[PDB]
């Protein structure tokens, strides 16, 4: 059926989110170890900086996943 | 403080460098070097020196609506108050060693 | 404690490192040259704190190789 | 049904804002651990400027999602 | 109906624009971190800086969402 | 009416500019921020080549959405 | 009308370029402002080499809308 | 067969998202280089953030490849 | 006429190289304004190196030109 | 022969991951040659780094082809 | 003729990756701007090393050009 | 013919991997020039850090080579 072809190709086209979140995922872990570089007595207050903004930027990774989960059951 | 036998082999630098050292043991927000400057063999003029400490009173001297430290692009390796604190220090340490070295030929 | 370069973290102070790189500079000197700049690396001085205004401990110094490369 | 098919691979596609959203949230992160490396005793204002960085580029991603309700469900 | 169809598709490809606006945006508030980290005395009028760039993001995000409010629901 | 469901996927297609001329605006309007914090003295002229770029900048989007218009109503 | 179609389909593929030609000039009039920060004196030989740099930037952005009108009205 | 072959091209498009994650991923491990350089003495300290961040952006890797591999065989 | 209906789409994908040349010839233009703001003296050979890069990207731009026009009208 | 045509279609889609993981790989090579141009007493050091990160950041491009491998002949 | 209809946008997609080597040649071109820039009395040695790059980059160009031609003419 | 036009679109559309293995080793040949710049007495070995991430990241390109010579023969 093109019902769920439509699905199947959409929800393929719809994890490309993932592209541009593990592109901010690996930008931002490395800026982690360049400021562990900087400052490393402060090393852990970073490790909690990133592991902070490593959920906060997670969540639309799930927001992508979500929008898949829609497609393909739902 | 009291330094003394500073002037029985020869003065250098890295005396006054531990001079100056001694002197950050202490944390001021400014020095002030009292010596006598040696213009002539019949003129010796006493000078007082001042070094203002980094990020204590440095900057705040030169906050002039903005600053006129802002005209320099630091290429240093950590930010501008670690490149003031060893532009502090080595201001200090060479004015000391300059002071006791006109303060002796005085 | 501590925040900064290599020196700042070590509880080193910039004249010291810069003492340091210009000591080990001058051991490497031509034998015309080091023998000449052996004589801008002694150190000759002594303090003593003045607490009171008539006593106080005394430290020395009588250092011919440069600044102590440990720390004090 | 094409109609149905068309909103699913639409709707598909649509999400691909959030790879450019993630990758600003990582950029945005990783700024906020270099520049707490820099200057780490100013890091409660730091994160204060992150939270209300990242709230402003998450309205990107609900404007996205916004679409992908408009597309999937309207 | 294939024009009711595809409309769909395209507001799908139309909302790809929104990433680059997220990125921007993330970029623009990772430069204000890094000069509140610089220089904290200015960091308030770093701010009235970054809401003007956020809002003048904001037009590219709301030219996006114009055309796609115009090939949805037109 | 293959035509004018045509336009709306051509037009979709053709309003993803709008993503690097926001990653554009927000690369200028951080540098804005970057370079009001090494001398704040002279951000008053800054602001006027950051208003000057952004006038810049939409001349590209003012093209991408005269092209859009022209897919759509012509 | 396959034709007609598909030259309003390949009009919207070729206005992508747009986005790069916008990121670009972001990049360079955010390095106008990063540049006039650092020596403002030279300010006006900044912003004559960025108005160099922008017409032989914008060359491309017209080197696209030539495609565009190409495939369109050709 | 459409629907035995459309998860072909799902798949094709869903693997786009290994893009990103190679893309920070050489990032990360680049910042780890630079790190390591800027202050050698903390560089088995770096690896480990970088072994760290390598993990925790390889995870949207493993995300990805579970939309993959679900469409690929759901 | 559906060599003469493809040609279009091809063309008009065949221009997305165009994108790449754009973001590349606005780091160069803004390079040369960051160098020109550093070394003023040498802005004058700095510029002579701004050209020869100009020259040697946009000579990718006419790469694409090329197959583009070898495209639509060969 | 549908089947067969988009097992062909899909693969060339999927490797489009090789080019982030291209991108990854020339940023952390480029960050090895600043590494060993700053230190170069450890230069040998840093390459151990970068022969890490290039076999770790190869394990994306070997996912991605194992993905190009299962839409071609499973 | 779907063969030869489907040539050209092979043909199309094929040359996007000119985008590629447009946007690394234009890092480089800025690169040898600011490394004439820092150290102008070696500029005619990295004039030297910006043209074995450009040569070498070029290469990634003319391997695109020629699976093009591939596509096209074989 | 619908398995020999399909293999000629996705040769076509894996030939954009090419792209990200171009910007990668400009980012890389690039950093050669901004790493000799920083220290010329050791600009002959950077030289050979260059050439062996120049064969390294050419790796990604005969990787996509191979698929491209691959669906189009096999």
Do not use: W
Not at chain 2, 86 to 94: A, K, Q, R, S
């Amino acid at each position: 059926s093109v019902l769920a072809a439509s699905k199947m190709v959409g929800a393929g086209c719809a994890t490309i989110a993932l592209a541009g979140v593990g592109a901010g995922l690996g930008v931002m872990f490395g800026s982690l170890i360049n400021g562990a570089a900087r400052n490393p007595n402060i090393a852990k207050q970073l490790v909690g900086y990133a592991l902070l903004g490593f959920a906060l930027t997670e969540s639309i990774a799930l927001f992508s996943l979500l929008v898949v989960f829609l497609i393909l059951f739902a | 403080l009291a330094i003394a036998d500073t002037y029985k082999v020869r003065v250098t630098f890295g005396q006054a460098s531990l001079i100056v050292e001694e002197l950050i043991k202490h944390n001021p927000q400014s020095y002030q070097i009292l010596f006598n400057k040696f213009r002539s063999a019949i003129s010796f003029k006493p000078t007082v020196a001042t070094i203002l400490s980094p990020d204590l009173l440095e900057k705040q001297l030169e906050d002039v609506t903005g600053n006129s430290l802002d005209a320099y692009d630091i290429e240093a390796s950590h930010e501008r108050s670690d490149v003031l604190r060893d532009l502090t220090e080595f201001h200090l340490g060479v004015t000391l060693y300059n002071a006791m070295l006109e303060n002796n030929c005085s | 404690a501590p925040s900064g370069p290599f020196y700042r973290v070590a509880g080193m102070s910039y004249l010291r490192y810069s003492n340091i790189c210009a000591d080990l500079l001058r051991n490497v000197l031509k034998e015309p040259f080091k023998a000449k700049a052996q004589a801008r690396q002694a150190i000759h001085f002594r303090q003593a704190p003045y607490v009171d205004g008539k006593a106080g401990a005394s430290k020395v110094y009588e250092l011919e190789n440069g600044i102590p490369k440990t720390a004090n």
